[PDB]
Amino acid sequence: TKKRRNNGRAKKGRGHVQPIRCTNCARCVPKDKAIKKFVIRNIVEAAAVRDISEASVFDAYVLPKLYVKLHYCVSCVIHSKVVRNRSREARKDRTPPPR
Amino acid sequence: QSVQVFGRKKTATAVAHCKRGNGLIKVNGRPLEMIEPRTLQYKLLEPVLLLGKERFAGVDIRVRVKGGGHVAQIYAIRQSISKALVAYYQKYVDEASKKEIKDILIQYDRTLLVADPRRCESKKFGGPGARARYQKSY
Amino acid sequence: QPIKLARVTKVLGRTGSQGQCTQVRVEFMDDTSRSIIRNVKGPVREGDVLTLLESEREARRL
Amino acid sequence: DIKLFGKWSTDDVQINDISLQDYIAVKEKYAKYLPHSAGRYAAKRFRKAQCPIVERLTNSMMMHGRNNGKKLMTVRIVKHAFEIIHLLTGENPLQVLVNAIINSGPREDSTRIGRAGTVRRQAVDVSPLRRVNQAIWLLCTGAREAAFRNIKTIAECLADELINAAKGSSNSYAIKKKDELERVAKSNR
RNA sequence: AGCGUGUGCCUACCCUACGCCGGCAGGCGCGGGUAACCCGUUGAACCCCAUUCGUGAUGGGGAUCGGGGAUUGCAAUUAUUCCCCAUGAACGAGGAAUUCCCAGUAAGUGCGGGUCAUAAGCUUGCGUUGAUUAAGUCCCUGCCCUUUGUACACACCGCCCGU
């Protein structure tokens, strides 16, 4: 049966979308179908921020940030628990988690 | 009438007939630290070092002490002396002095008025005892 | 290596395959308290005193 | 003759503090003139530590199958030949209690690691209650499993442990094992 | 100690006290008990106690296995029956494989009931000595409450594909 109305991708009004490689397995997944995460974290973790700040030559250096873009195939996105399977009705909900 | 609960604990009992009399210092009728099992013999020497010799010139506590078990027969003499002082002071002068010596004795140690409720529990099915079970094969 | 007194506010819980480690949240008493979370084991009294004999060991979760 | 108890004094016995009762706390109903009370310390957690480390040391020495729980032996250890030496010392009697552990006391241990591998151990430390629990559980267990058939046998098993039990030194030997492994665990930072 | 048992309707196969004195249960007598009444303050008791080891293959714990009097059983040996002399038992933590267990619990220890003629190494209970660990988790083995997939419904020990 037709599980998803959008076929589990975002291809509307075009024939071909360029593929990308999953960051985990290096699988070829279309860019609309791939599950994209954008992690903007700190280069130095919280347990290491304090020690780096004390050792800093500059007062209030404001630490740099790490910007990483992750593309997951469906298998690796499900295994890594980035997304889970939802009920037939909860599947239609497109609201992102509040975080 | 007659109010007499004497001392008891676990299994053993020191029947403490409280009245006027000689009231010499004796445990099982025997001297201060002289008991034959020789294990818990100091428990009575402590209080009588505070008041004085005059105070025990008229308190005859005739005790029928029966019962095997140290933690029973000992720790029942302390209960018995606590109740003896309590009754004597309550009846004679007032309960304020009984309040005071009971305060020192009971806040000194909790375990007079409270006994161990633990007792051997029932054996059950398919096992050598209460909780253990017979070995299960496959 | 100075031992700092820490009061427990919340016990995070047990970690391990079968459950063998503990995690709690602790704060200072009157020493510009910070809500710092560290690994504990077993008994934690009501307002106990964790020994932050080191201020840089924030036991990491996950 | 205004001294309190039978061994303490109040006129000129000054400890210049009150904050020195981590393991020993006898100020309430839990006082019995001798540590002979029978009783239970497994009814609920934290109770083994609430047994003061003096009573814990002398009374948690009940392991193996020959002297397992029998309290006459703790009575012998603490009753005979200690109250006498308390005054036969001639010096200040605090030395025995305050010459044991304040540098011995283990201040870290660790926990198992991952799904594959045992060559390290994730660092954990506790408030005194569980550190005393774990460290001296393993101490008593090791001392009994290895020190079976002991030349340091009872009727003289008061001195060494009552001098390396409570507080005030770095001289205990299973404690040195756990302190070296404590440093090994401490390396996880 | 405490749980209990105990006899004349086919139970003349009850529980036993006390005296027989080869050294005490005991084959002979003489009594008690249909029982809170007698066994019984429970008839060759625990843990403990200078027979003692200031260390340990010894006195300290039983290696086949002989006697002194035999509870008295159509046989006992081809399942009943009672202390000891030191000739040493791998005499002090155990193949993969595993069972049970959270306090008066495990374990040690004996005592009753059933079976029965006293018949137990069985079971079912009862006391007595009495802990080490843990106040957690879903890793293993499984269970439950939800969502999900299924070509299964004999229900995954299923269905099924190709020489």
UniProtKB/Swiss-Prot annotation, chain A:
Instruction: Choose one Gene Ontology CC annotation of this protein and give it.
Output: cytoplasm
Q: Which disease is it linked to?
A: Diamond-Blackfan anemia 10: A form of Diamond-Blackfan anemia, a congenital non-regenerative hypoplastic anemia that usually presents early in infancy. Diamond-Blackfan anemia is characterized by a moderate to severe macrocytic anemia, erythroblastopenia, and an increased risk of malignancy. 30 to 40% of Diamond-Blackfan anemia patients present with short stature and congenital anomalies, the most frequent being craniofacial (Pierre-Robin syndrome and cleft palate), thumb and urogenital anomalies.
The annotated regions of Basic and acidic residues compositional bias extend over 86-96
**Which InterPro entries does the protein's record reference?**
Ribosomal_eS26, Ribosomal_eS26_CS, Ribosomal_eS26_sf
| Pfam family, any one | Ribosomal_S26e
Phosphoserine PTM positions read 53
Query: Transmembrane residues, as ranges?
Result: none
Kindly report the protein's main subcellular placement as a broad class: cytoplasm
- Keywords on this record? Cytoplasm, Diamond-Blackfan anemia, Disease variant, Endoplasmic reticulum, Phosphoprotein, Ribonucleoprotein, Ribosomal protein
One GO molecular function term of this record is:
mRNA binding
Entry's Gene Ontology BP terms? cytoplasmic translation; negative regulation of RNA splicing; translation
Is the Transcription regulation keyword given for this protein? no
Into which family does the record put it?
Answer: Belongs to the eukaryotic ribosomal protein eS26 family.
Give the source species: Homo sapiens (Human)
Localization terms from the record: Cytoplasm, Cytosol; Cytoplasm; Rough endoplasmic reticulum
Q: What does this protein do?
A: Component of the small ribosomal subunit. The ribosome is a large ribonucleoprotein complex responsible for the synthesis of proteins in the cell.
Subunit composition and interactions: Component of the 40S small ribosomal subunit.
Protein name per the record: Small ribosomal subunit protein eS26
Swiss-Prot record, chain B:
Q: Which GO terms describe its molecular function?
A: RNA binding; structural constituent of ribosome
Q: Does the keyword Ribosomal protein apply?
A: yes
Report the residues modified as N6-acetyllysine. Answer: 53
Q: Which UniProt keywords apply?
A: Acetylation, Cytoplasm, Nucleus, Phosphoprotein, Ribonucleoprotein, Ribosomal protein
Which Gene3D superfamilies does the protein's record reference? 3.30.230.10
Using the UniProt record, give the first listed, main subcellular location.
cytoplasm
Pfam families from the UniProt entry: Ribosomal_S9
User: What does the record give as the function of this protein?
Assistant: Component of the small ribosomal subunit. The ribosome is a large ribonucleoprotein complex responsible for the synthesis of proteins in the cell. Part of the small subunit (SSU) processome, first precursor of the small eukaryotic ribosomal subunit. During the assembly of the SSU processome in the nucleolus, many ribosome biogenesis factors, an RNA chaperone and ribosomal proteins associate with the nascent pre-rRNA and work in concert to generate RNA folding, modifications, rearrangements and cleavage as well as targeted degradation of pre-ribosomal RNA by the RNA exosome.
* Identification of the protein by name: Small ribosomal subunit protein uS9
Q: What is the lineage of its organism?
A: Eukaryota, Metazoa, Chordata, Craniata, Vertebrata
Q: Which gene encodes it?
A: RPS16
Swiss-Prot record, chain C:
Keywords, comma-separated and alphabetical = Acetylation, Cytoplasm, Diamond-Blackfan anemia, Endoplasmic reticulum, Nucleus, Phosphoprotein, Ribonucleoprotein, Ribosomal protein
Subunit structure and binding partners: Component of the 40S small ribosomal subunit. Part of the small subunit (SSU) processome, composed of more than 70 proteins and the RNA chaperone small nucleolar RNA (snoRNA) U3.
Tell whether Coiled coil is among the UniProt keywords. no
Q: Which residues cross the membrane?
A: none
Describe the disease involvement stated in the record for this chain. Answer: Diamond-Blackfan anemia 15, with mandibulofacial dysostosis: A form of Diamond-Blackfan anemia, a congenital non-regenerative hypoplastic anemia that usually presents early in infancy. Diamond-Blackfan anemia is characterized by a moderate to severe macrocytic anemia, erythroblastopenia, and an increased risk of malignancy. 30 to 40% of Diamond-Blackfan anemia patients present with short stature and congenital anomalies, the most frequent being craniofacial (Pierre-Robin syndrome and cleft palate), thumb and urogenital anomalies.
* Family to which the UniProt record says this protein belongs: Belongs to the eukaryotic ribosomal protein eS28 family.
GO CC field: cytoplasm; cytoplasmic side of rough endoplasmic reticulum membrane; cytosol; cytosolic small ribosomal subunit; extracellular exosome; nucleolus; nucleoplasm; ribosome
Residues where Phosphoserine is found = 35
- What biological-process GO terms show up in the record? cytoplasmic translation; maturation of SSU-rRNA; ribosomal small subunit assembly; ribosomal small subunit biogenesis; ribosome biogenesis; rRNA processing; translation
From Swiss-Prot, chain D:
Which CDD domains does the entry mention? Answer: uS7_Eukaryote
**Residues bearing Phosphoserine?**
127
Is this entry keyworded Kinase?
no
Placement of covalent cross-link Glycyl lysine isopeptide (Lys-Gly) (interchain with G-Cter in SUMO2): 32
In this UniProt entry, the residues modified to N6-acetyllysine are 32
PROSITE patterns recorded = RIBOSOMAL_S7 (PS00052)
One cellular-component annotation, GO: extracellular exosome
Query: Gene3D superfamilies from the xrefs?
Result: Ribosomal protein S7 domain
What is known about what this protein does? Component of the small ribosomal subunit. The ribosome is a large ribonucleoprotein complex responsible for the synthesis of proteins in the cell. Part of the small subunit (SSU) processome, first precursor of the small eukaryotic ribosomal subunit. During the assembly of the SSU processome in the nucleolus, many ribosome biogenesis factors, an RNA chaperone and ribosomal proteins associate with the nascent pre-rRNA and work in concert to generate RNA folding, modifications, rearrangements and cleavage as well as targeted degradation of pre-ribosomal RNA by the RNA exosome.
Q: What name goes with this protein?
A: Small ribosomal subunit protein uS7
Question: What species does this protein belong to?
Answer: Homo sapiens
